[PDB]
C-alpha cells in the first residue's frame, strides 16, 4: 500500500510504504485534515516532532498541536504532532480525540516506538479511531536501493589509511566536503590525532562522525565502516542475564541513511568497507526489557498491561519481529516490588538506560547495606558509602561491568532464575 489509504467506514489498520520525501509526516496528515478528520502523527524523535510543527507553520500557515516530553503546544488544530513517548505519557489513546493515527517511522525499534505503536494498535479502535496507518520508507525486509545521484565505490585495501581492514586514498578526501562514519567514539576519532577533521560545529572539510550526527551539513562523499554498535541481552546465567553491546553489520536503514548524507540534490560518491548489509526488520529482546522498564518507571503500567500492548504489536503483521520474551520480561518485572521511590526518581532524572532496573538493584543494595556492582556513574544514587560498603553485592542482573565481589542467593536473584526456567524455551 504505497499511496495514502482512504478513510474506511469501519476500523482498519493500513500500511503505508513510501519514500521520505513523500511527506508521510506532512502531506498525508494535511490531506486527511483537509477532509475533516482530526489526525495524530507519531514520531520517535523529539526533534522530528518539533520540526514537523515548524515546517507546517512556516510552509503552510498550519499551527499544529505539538506534544513532546520537554514541551507542549495546544492550538486546537485538527493535526497533532507527538512523540511516541509523549503519547505514552498522555495515557495512550485518550477518548474520541483522533479519527486517524499515523505511526510514522513504524520501522523504528527503539522502546518508545514499539510500546507506543503497540499501544495504538491495542487501543485505537476502542478509543474511536477509524484508521491506523503504519508508515515507513523501509518496511521489514527492505534492502538499500541504488541512488541516482550517488555513485558507490568499494574501498580497496590500497590506500594510506587504516580503515576497518581496508583503506582510503587521501586523494579521495582532499579536499572537499567529506563524511566518515565509525562505530565507536574511540575509533570515531582515534581515526585519530590522525591529521581538517574532528568528531557542533563546522560551516573544505572531513567529518568523522558516529551515528549521533542526526540526518538533515554539505557533503560531496560519504565513507562508511558499515558496522554499528547495538544493545543486546545475554542470558549469561551468571546469575541471570546481562545487558551488553555488540558490533554487528549495519542494516539497510543504517546504510541508506548514512549514504544519504551525500548526493543531496548535487551528485555525490559513496565509499564502503563492505558491500553488504543485514536487511531491516529485527530487534533484540533487550528492547522488550526496556519497554517493561519504561512502563514501570515512566508510565505507571503494571507489567501485565505492558504485555497487552506489546502483544498487539507482535500480533500485527508487517512490523519488525523479535524473540517472543513477553512472558519472561513480564515475570521479571512483576517480581521487582517495593522499589525505593527516591532512587527511581534519580535514575529517571539521570537518564540511565534502564532506570527501573538501575534503581531496583540500588534498592536491594541499600536494604542489604551492600554496595553497588561497581562505582560507575550509574549508581550515583547510592552516595551513602560507608554504611553500605560492607561485603558482597547481591547481584540481580548485570547492567555493566561488575567490579565488586558478589553473592548470588538473594530471593529476587533466585526469582529471576526461576522465571528463566519458566519462560525461556529449549
Ligand X SMILES: O=C(O)Cc1cn(Cc2cccc(Cl)c2)c2ccccc12
Do 340 and 362 meet the contact criterion of CB atoms below 8 Å apart? yes
Selection from its own copies, ligand X, Ca ion, none that 111 binds (CB < 5 to 8 A by kind) is ligand X
Do 111 and 290 meet the contact criterion of CB atoms below 8 Å apart? yes
Which residues carry a binding-site annotation for Ca(2+)?
234, 244
User: Where is the chain broken, named by the residue before each break, C–N > 2.5 Å?
Assistant: 195, 199, 203, 216
3-state secondary structure of 77: coil
Selection from Ca ion, ligand X, its own copies, none that 315 binds (CB < 5 to 8 A by kind) is its own copies
Residue (22 or 232) nearer to its own copies, CB: 232
Do 50 and 66 meet the contact criterion of CB atoms below 8 Å apart? yes
* Contact with ligand X (CB under 6 A) among 30, 40, 56, 115: 115
- Site pattern 225..244 for its own copies (x: CB under 8 A): --x-x----x-x--------
Using CB under 8 A as the binding rule, the residues of this chain from 153 to 192 that contact its own copies are 154, 164-165, 183-184, 186-187
Cell of 68: 513532546
- Per CB under 6 A, the segment of 10-18, 53-61, 111-119, 318-326 that binds ligand X is 111-119
The verdict on 56 binding ligand X (CB under 6 A) reads: no
Cell of 165: 581492514
Which residues carry a binding-site annotation?
234, 244
CA distance 199 to 187: 10
Residue (341 or 426) nearer to its own copies, CB: 426
* Contact with ligand X (CB under 6 A) among 43, 68, 136, 256: 68
The closest alpha carbon to 28, from 114, 92, 96, 101, belongs to 101
Residue 160: how many other CB atoms lie within 10 Å: 9
Cell of 148: 541516482
3-state secondary structure of 227: strand
Crossing angle for the helix pair 285-297 and 341-350, to the nearest 10 degrees: 120
Name the minimum Å distance from CB 425 to Ca ion.
13
Contacts to its own copies by CB under 8 A: 140-143, 154, 164-165, 183-184, 186-187, 227, 229, 234, 236, 245, 247-249, 252, 273-282, 314-324, 326-327, 425-426
Contacts to ligand X by CB under 6 A: 46, 68-69, 83, 85-86, 89, 111-112, 115, 290-291, 294, 298
Amino acid at each position: 500500500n504505497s499511496s495514502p489509504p482512504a478513510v474506511p467506514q469501519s476500523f482498519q489498520v493500513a500500511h503505508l510504504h513510501a519514500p521520505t520525501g513523500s511527506g508521510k509526516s506532512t502531506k498525508v496528515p494535511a490531506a486527511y485534515a483537509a477532509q475533516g478528520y482530526k489526525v495524530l502523527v507519531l514520531n520517535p524523535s523529539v526533534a522530528a516532532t518539533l520540526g514537523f510543527g515548524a515546517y507546517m507553520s512556516k510552509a503552510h500557515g498550519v499551527d499544529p498541536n505539538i506534544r513532546t516530553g520537554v514541551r507542549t503546544i495546544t492550538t486546537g488544530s485538527p493535526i497533532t504532532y507527538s512523540t511516541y513517548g509523549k503519547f505514552l505519557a498522555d495515557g495512550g489513546c485518550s477518548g474520541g480525540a483522533y479519527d486517524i493515527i499515523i505511526c510514522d517511522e513504524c520501522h523504528s525499534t527503539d522502546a518508545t516506538s514499539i510500546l507506543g505503536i503497540g499501544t495504538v494498535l491495542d487501543q485505537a479502535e476502542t478509543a474511536g479511531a477509524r484508521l491506523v496507518v503504519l508508515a515507513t520508507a523501509t518496511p521489514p525486509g527492505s534492502v538499500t536501493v541504488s541512488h541516482p545521484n550517488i555513485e558507490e565505490v568499494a574501498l580497496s585495501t590500497t590506500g594510506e589509511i587504516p580503515f576497518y581492514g581496508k583503506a582510503i586514498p587521501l586523494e579521495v578526501i582532499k579536499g572537499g566536503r567529506h563524511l566518515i562514519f565509525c562505530h565507536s567514539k574511540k575509533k570515531c576519532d582515534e581515526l585519530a590525532a590522525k591529521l581538517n577533521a574532528v568528531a557542533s560545529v563546522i560551516p573544505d572539510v572531513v567529518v568523522v562522525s558516529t551515528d549521533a550526527l542526526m540526518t538533515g551539513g554539505d557533503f560531496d562523499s560519504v565513507i562508511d565502516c558499515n558496522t554499528c554498535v547495538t544493545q543486546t541481552v545475554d542470558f549469561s546465567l551468571d546469575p541471570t542475564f546481562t545487558i551488553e553491546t555488540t558490533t554487528l553489520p549495519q542494516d539497510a536503514v543504517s546504510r541508506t541513511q548514512r549514504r544519504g548524507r551525500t548526493g543531496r540534490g548535487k551528485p555525490g560518491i559513496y565509499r564502503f568497507v563492505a558491500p553488504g548489509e543485514r536487511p531491516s526488520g529485527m530487534f533484540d529482546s533487550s528492547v522488550l526489557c526496556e519497554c517493561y522498564d519504561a512502563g514501570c518507571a515512566w508510565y505507571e503500567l503494571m507489567p501485565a498491561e505492558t504485555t497487552v500492548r506489546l502483544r498487539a504489536y507482535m500480533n500485527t503483521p508487517g512490523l519488525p519481529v523479535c524473540q517472543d520474551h513477553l512472558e519472561f520480561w513480564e515475570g521479571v518485572f512483576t517480581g521487582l516490588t517495593h522499589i525505593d521511590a527516591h532512587f527511581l526518581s534519580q535514575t529517571k532524572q539521570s537518564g540511565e538506560n534502564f532506570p527501573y532496573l538501575v534503581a531496583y538493584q540500588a534498592t536491594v543494595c541499600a536494604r542489604a547495606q551492600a554496595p553497588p556492582p561497581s562505582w560507575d556513574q550509574m549508581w550515583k544514587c547510592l552516595i551513602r558509602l560507608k554504611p553500605t560498603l560492607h561485603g558482597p553485592t547481591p547481584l540481580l542482573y548485570r547492567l555493566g561491568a561488575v567490579q565488586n565481589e558478589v553473592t548470588l542467593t538473594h530471593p529476587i536473584t533466585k526469582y529471576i532464575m526461576t522465571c528463566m526456567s519458566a519462560d525461556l524455551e529449549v
